Ligand SMILES: Nc1nc2c(ncn2[C@@H]2O[C@H](COP(=O)(O)OP(=O)(O)OP(=O)(O)O)[C@@H](O)[C@H]2O)c(=O)[nH]1
Ligand SMILES: Nc1nc2c(ncn2[C@@H]2O[C@H](COP(=O)(O)OP(=O)(O)O)[C@@H](O)[C@H]2O)c(=O)[nH]1
Ligand SMILES: [Ca+2]
Ligand SMILES: [Mg+2]
């Protein structure tokens with residue numbers, strides 16, 4: 066009966082840890098995906114500032 | 124004691140839940156306002172129908188059910204429909220933005236925002252139970268909530284309730300009513316994630332139910348309402364041992380012992396008879412022998428596959444209505460000769476149960492009200508054909524990485540696709556190993 | 563609950579945008595004063611997708627009218643349904659774009675872009691659950707092509723997790739307004755490839771050939787072309803506006819239609835221009851496509867079919883299976899079940915039954931090859947480049963746009979020649 070208790074608790078523990086691992090890994094990946102999207106849009110804004118500056122120098 | 128909590132996830136799960144709970148009320152004489160005049164013990168009791176219904180002091184019989192969807196459209200119809208007074212508002216949980224047929228959105232992006240509320244509401248039902256037996260989770264494979272949120276919920280139920288039993292009713296995708304190209308992806312992902320958290324799963328192939336409505340009920344273009352009323356009859360047959368009592372009644376968990384020889388081999392094939400229109404049932408009573416012989420006709424199966432090309436590891440017959448063992452034994456003896464190959468490590472007997480409560484039909488439906496019905500639950504290697512068809516469609520799209528960006532964009536990795544597919548590959552190999560003769 | 567914010571920019575965008583609101587207001591039973599005088603509850607069940615509810619049970623379109631000149635927008639306010647738009651949602655300039663993409667994207671349009679974003683946020687902040695945005699514009703002009711692709715980029719910064727849909731009108735020499743149109747189209751495609759989730763290609767060359775050859779119009783006007791656009795836009799948005807379960811919102815449509823993020827340019831189709839077999843056959847014919855591409859010159863990645871009117875769903879199911887079996891060569895094998903069919907009971911105005919076709923076909927490269935050929939025929943001689951370098955651009959940005967659109971065609975060809983085994 067001690068082995069049955071230990072096996073059930075290990076199942077609960079492994080499941081709780083795998084899920085927290087997945088939810089944390091997923092949170093970082095989605096945030097990294099969104100941070101790369103904004104950085105590309107912000108580099109397009111810097112290129113727009115250089116275009117308007119290049120015209121000012123003409 | 125022995126209470127059962129039902130959890131209906133996503134559109135398919137919810138709409139099938141509507142069909143099942145309506146059917147249950149008809150079977151137990153419960154009115155749309157929850158009142159049950161035949162129930163004399165007010166406020167509670169230990170009757171067989173209390174495994175599925177709790178009682179309030181005002182005489183209302185409340186389903187032990189939770190309806191969860193990530194959008195409100197489908198559950199709003201429950202909140203305003205015929206049985207709106209049957210459910211307490213806290214049992215109907217909705218979000219605002221669905222999972223867009225994306226497993227990752229149901230398991231992570233959208234589903235993580237409501238999972239704590241759902242588990243809290245499930246806890247409220249469990250606290251009302253004096254001896255909770257387990258959960259019944261109803262969901263589709265193909266939808267983003269049905270697949271993703273169900274996997275997240277099953278994982279969390281294992282944590283919050285240990286090894287307490289969890290049974291699934293899973294809608295396998297069919298192109299005739301499918302709404303998303305990526306349904307093979309969602310199917311493989313949720314099956315891999317739930318496999319170690321589920322004790323027993325009853326797959327319902329929408330194409331098998333579609334063909335049955337077209338062939339046996341003469342419905343030209345079946346709707347979800349056509350499919351769900353048929354699905355609820357099978358669900359009713361499976362749960363009838365929990366909700367009714369009888370001398371010849373065999374508890375579902377006693378069938379489950381025979382149906383699951385190994386933890387991963389837990390997908391019974393269900394077959395139901397008779398499915399017959401009123402026009403054809405008039406002056407044509409189907410005997411115990413006729414409905415039993417229809418259980419071995421592959422066209423009556425809930426999953427398209429050929430058991431004739433597989434091996435049996437278990438065969439359970441669940442009769443309801445006017446059925447006595449003498450007729451059953453006679454009908455079985457006929458079938459054992461005219462039809463059934465077992466694996467060499469399993470006894471060849473048929474496990475029989477009989478609930479004398481006669482079948483019920485929903486008013487305005489297409490099923491005839493018959494005097495006797497039967498659901499066969501068999502464990503056959505042939506059900507692995509349904510995994511093969513689904514795994515083939517997965518491979519076609521994934522070899523080109525088609526649509527995988529919708530999943531990576533929500534935080535998933537390609538490694539989860541390959542890890543899930545390899546689990547299915549091992550599952551197919553497991554179904555082959557159990558069929559090989561011993562040495 | 564699931565709201566779409568509509569934006570129309572430039573001359574073409576405001577023109578087809580006004581025609582779009584006139585058609586769907588009629589289908590939803592909305593008069594030019596914003597009141598509901600319909601007869602079916604199916605018209606108001608999903609009315610909040612395109613309409614806000616105001617005081618007096620009024621329905622105000624969730625639309626934002628943008629242009630760098632007041633000429634086109636003044637006629638919208640005076641035309642039919644001109645009083646139904648919110649007066650504050652009119653954002654117009656004075657200088658204009660002069661059919662110059664650089665002017666709409668970098669100089670003139672960037673001075674106005676902030677005042678448009680103020681209206682976008684005001685409409686988005688009151689949304690119960692914003693789906694995303696849809697833009698109507700032309701790619702051959704200046705305001706719709708330049709400031710349109712600019713607005714797309716700026717909105718995607720504040721709403722990166724929302725769907726960006728565009729109804730983009732491709733330029734054609736048969737309806738040519740200027741000569742620098744291949745420059746504006748290539749520069750706009752360069753942006754639409756990166757910052758949109760789904761783009762309907764409304765090709766002017768296809769619209770002209772339909773009016774001339776099929777509709778028998780020797781001198782097609784812009785009003786004749788826009789009648790095809792309104793019927794097409796009404797079709798592709800049917801599943802968004804009426805109760806249903808297939809492609810009922812912008813994201814489920816994208817998930818069904820876009821197997822790879824860059825290949826998100828759809829070929830629209832309409833029929834008729836009458837039985838279910840004939841309606842299905844004409845819907846897959848090249849002469850009914852709103853893009854100048856022969857689908858039998860490529861392969862279908864995904865397809866959305868929409869049938870409208872009272873008909874046999876059993877017959878529609880059989881005819882859609884029939885056309886896929888008899889034409890299986892034109893559907894990629896590595897995407898099973900890539901054709902989805904929706905049925906709506908409410909037909910368009912003046913038809914017993916109609917069909918709308920949304921296709922992601924690799925034959926769309928014929929459209930991008932034509933614009934790339936008109937682009938390289940001018941860029942190799944540096945023609946008209948002073949219109950753009952004068953605003954601050956350089957030849958590098960032109961080459962990058964050319965290379966990106968040529969990569970789009972290569973990618974469409976890659977999946978056309980891909981096999982299952
Ligand atoms: N048998 C049956 N199948 C259904 C029903 N509703 C949807 N389906 C099937 O379920 C799959 C789609 O999943 P849904 O349940 O609609 O999706 P969902 O769980 O709500 O997830 P999202 O809407 O993407 O957030 C398709 O295979 C449909 O054919 C139903 O009422 N009965
Ligand atoms: N179908 C259609 N095309 C148009 C319409 N108006 C302009 N166009 C096309 O749009 C291009 C010119 O863009 P335009 O809208 O005038 O530039 P903008 O005002 O700066 O956005 C040309 O290639 C025309 O063919 C219209 O009402 N209908
Ligand atoms: Ca009681
Ligand atoms: Mg849903």
Ligand SMILES: [Mg+2]
Nearest residue numbers: 573574703739
């Ligand atoms: Mg113009």
